[PDB]
Amino acid sequence: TLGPVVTGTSVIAIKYKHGIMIAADRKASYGSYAKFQNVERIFKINNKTVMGFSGELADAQYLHELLTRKNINNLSEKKRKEDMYTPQHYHSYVSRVFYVRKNRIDPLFNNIIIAGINSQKYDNNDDNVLLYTNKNNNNEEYKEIHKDDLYIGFVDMHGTNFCDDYITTGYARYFALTLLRDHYKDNMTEEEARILINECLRILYFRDATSSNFIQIVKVTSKGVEYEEPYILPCVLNSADYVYPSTLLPPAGCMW
Amino acid sequence: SMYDRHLTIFSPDGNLYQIEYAIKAVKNTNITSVGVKGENCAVIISQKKMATQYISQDKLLDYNNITNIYNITDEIGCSMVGMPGDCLSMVYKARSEASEFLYSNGYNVNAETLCRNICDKIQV
């Protein structure tokens, strides 16, 4: 891969009282051409781990296949739920991949978020793993997971990697990151987390040309990994001066 | 000297006689214009008459074309009295001044500023 051709825009992941909430719009752009409008940019690695990407779709798919086979081998060798790999383990794996490809100067044109639950003490989902049937889609309360038991990690093109209570890629790394550094707080409820993420996505939709308002939300919780029904974000302009007709401005000068 | 009344140089009494002669030339056209100002309106009335000059008023002359009133812009108007060539020249100068002001400043010149710029040109 010499460079990006078909690309996805920012991803946002945050911690809240019940786990991880990760959001991305379902759009992949072939330049300035929004060719694909229903693309999946968040993938499930196992019952406690998800991967989001921003950048080249081909490299993201390559990494997704690598992680899928890594999970299958882990499951083959598993004897107890403690044997399942953790989000930290997958983050280390992806960071090593990126570092080696940097050394070869054959990078993946991507920024990756690896998020999930770093513990096995909140459920028995990994006692019997189902890969081809999702029993989730029969409702019990969510479990309040400790912040220290959750994991969000970032990897970039040069192999730079770290973790935090919230991670952003793309233009989120400016807009959503400012909003999160201002307003994020610990143990947010699901509705509060969704409201914060929706504000960030609305600002991104208004100020980023490669984004859409068709949003995919994924929750990693004690119930496992849940994909929400994709929804259209309502995005209205915040000023009537935008809508004011141009013919009502003075006809002389550079009023535009 | 022998040219204090031929050129715009001071006469011994401190006068510039060429300016007085130009004023007399304007006065000799026998064209009258009256401008009045209201509370929210201004009106200029003038004669649709040909300024007296070497030529006279012919029977086949188009009398609608005879006018001493002009538009400098859409919102600024004038009435010019004097030698007709000079009046046309002044009208064109004022129009170019207004257009240059509009382009340079992003808004339309007002009558006071236009008149003052015209007088600055006349001083030369």
TrEMBL record, chain A:
Highest taxon, organism lineage: Eukaryota
GO annotation, biological process: proteolysis involved in protein catabolic process
Subcellular localization: Cytoplasm; Nucleus
Listed GO CC annotations: cytoplasm; nucleus; proteasome core complex, beta-subunit complex
Transcription as UniProt keyword: no
InterPro entries on file: Ntn_hydrolases_N, Proteasome_beta4, Proteasome_bsu_CS, Proteasome_sua/b, Proteasome_suB-type
Family matches, as Gene3D superfamilies: Glutamine Phosphoribosylpyrophosphate, subunit 1, domain 1
Similarity remark: Belongs to the peptidase T1B family.
Name of protein: Proteasome subunit beta
Species for this entry: Plasmodium falciparum (isolate Dd2)
From TrEMBL, chain B:
Organism: Plasmodium falciparum (isolate 3D7)
Superkingdom per UniProt: Eukaryota
Residues annotated as domain Proteasome alpha-type subunits: 3-25
Compartment(s): Cytoplasm; Nucleus
Protein family per UniProt: Belongs to the peptidase T1A family.
Protein name in UniProt: Proteasome subunit alpha type-6, putative
